[PDB]
Amino acid sequence: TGYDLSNSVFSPDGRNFQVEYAVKAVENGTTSIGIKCNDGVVFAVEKLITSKLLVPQKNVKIQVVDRHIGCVYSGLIPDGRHLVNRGREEAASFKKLYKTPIPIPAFADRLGQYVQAHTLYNSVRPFGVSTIFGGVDKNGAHLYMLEPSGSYWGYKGAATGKGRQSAKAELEKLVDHHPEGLSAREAVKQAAKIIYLAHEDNKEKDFELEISWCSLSETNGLHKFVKGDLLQEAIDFAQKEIN
Template structure:
């Protein structure tokens, strides 16, 4: 990349001779180097999870949130730069509020994704800004049912049944492909997602981590909230047992 990109990666508005925008690719690398984020669309809701690697023993558990509420029924999780995640979450909340004030009803996720995608794409079009260094997962329950999307640093967005971004995403995607979310409840989804996050985490390289998980479903009355502590503890314990059983079989 460096041999081709030299001189063409100084501005986000500059194309290389072969039509690439290197700063967008660099932003994607920043997202890929962060802890994994997973989204799972179940038959009755959506589960979001983020692997928060503990870079210091002094960090307060539960204080540094990586998943934000965009609206009552919409949650946003991302892998990559934390500041970019919070900025985009705030912008998405403003767009959701603007939609509600204009049309008098909660925003549908597809309409919200069109606005977020356009906003992220704008940051790849002008020399005075840089792309967002995050890959973003957005989940919701709207009038069409559970929905799940991913927004890339380029501004492109895609609808998914299940998705993973960040470090370890390939292993996570392989595990997600084995699941049938259309027959799974969100409570079952919480346990499966916890198992996958524990599976992809590398203790040798990353050390300790904290699992942050939220859900939207019938048990939350359609609101995006954090998974209750007792259920999260139960899910993590089940995940550790499953990993130990797999190691014993090997």
């Protein structure tokens, strides 16, 4: 034994336990989701209100990469920021050499390879975040989710954090009860609901909802934060559904 004490060591079953322990930190984080819609993507996240002293609207968690990609994550927040900074360098260098803004699948692999590299050596620690990200490129909308092992796939909808089971089930319903499509505006409302539903498993504290989206028609393919009236509306849609 002692196989779990060092990153990059295979156990006798062929597992990297340090990566599996990184997942535990992710499973201990706040719930975050992504929903792919007809011409875009929506991202939402639960921000726990630790105290009344937190300034509302002011500790933003969703992050833009370039101008067309949104990223949200659950787990160790600083690890997520580190990963987005790297993502921004990778997007900048791609656009520098190739002119066109980085395609979402290309961007996903850039993050994938970087996260995977942190499972190759004992001199570094795996990332303690699962990251949901995506946006619009020249081939349409794309939504990805990336784990601490470096593993990622494309998704119709995705969820991570403490309320991931609840949110998955909610996402599975949307996929079945809308086999032809979901509009960006619908998806914003649905995102609000699913976060409110997933908040059951973090009930001791009350929370702040945060949403963003990129849609070819609603935002011109750029990533924007859902603010003001449209935010309030989706909050109302969500509040009516929990009764």
